Amino acid sequence: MVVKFMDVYQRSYCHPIETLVDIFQEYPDEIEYIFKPSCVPLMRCGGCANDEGLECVPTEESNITMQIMRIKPHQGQHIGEMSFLQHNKCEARP
Amino acid sequence: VVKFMDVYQRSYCHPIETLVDIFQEYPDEIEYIFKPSCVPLMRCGGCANDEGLECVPTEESNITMQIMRIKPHQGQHIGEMSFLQHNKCEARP
């Protein structure tokens, strides 16, 4: 099995990739909460690090809602719907 | 809405497509230019935590890819490069 060069090159091009994202990062006003799970997999644009000043940016986005366990210090476990941003399409840009 | 048990299971340590710099995998070739400069590989990932839990591979394989390489004073070559992939993972303390 060898992946051909043109496929390799195309596969590495800026595209949405499954990415573990910390829930607190997406819900910065909920610093006091413990979340289970603490991170969720979201489709997020990714491309190769380069020295040409290019970044991989989303050109189409959508939301996904997930039931997350939300816990305060000595309060009981709640299960709540939380919405997260996903990337559906990407492009490389300065 | 994704159900809680589905969510929880999806976040458990598992192989995830991960962009890996060729220079990270082959640091002895940092003098050279590769195209593309990174490749997508399946690698174990789990949620960051302070409980000392790591996410580690329990089954692995190699994938070979044609990569363009250029060394100083030479033209472009295309050749096979092998990379490690993770096929199964488990969380461990």
Determination technique for this PDB entry?
A: X-ray
* CB-CB contact of A68 with B4 (8 Å): yes
- Which helix (H) or strand (E) covers residue A91, if one does? strand A78-93
Backbone angles phi, psi at A2, to 5 degrees: -125, 125
- What resolution does the deposited structure have, in angstroms? 1.3
Contact list, B7 vs chain A (CB under 8 Å): 37, 40, 66-68
B8 with A50: Cβ contact below 8 A: no
Instruction: State how far the alpha carbon of A90 is from the alpha carbons of A46, A56, B16, B17, B91, in Å.
Output: 8, 6, 19, 16, 32
Q: Domains of chain B by range and CATH?
A: 1-93 (2.10.90.10)
* CB-CB contact of A12 with A23 (8 Å): no
Tell me, yes or no, if A41 comes closer than 8 A to chain B by beta carbon. Answer: yes
* CB-CB contact of A42 with B45 (8 Å): no
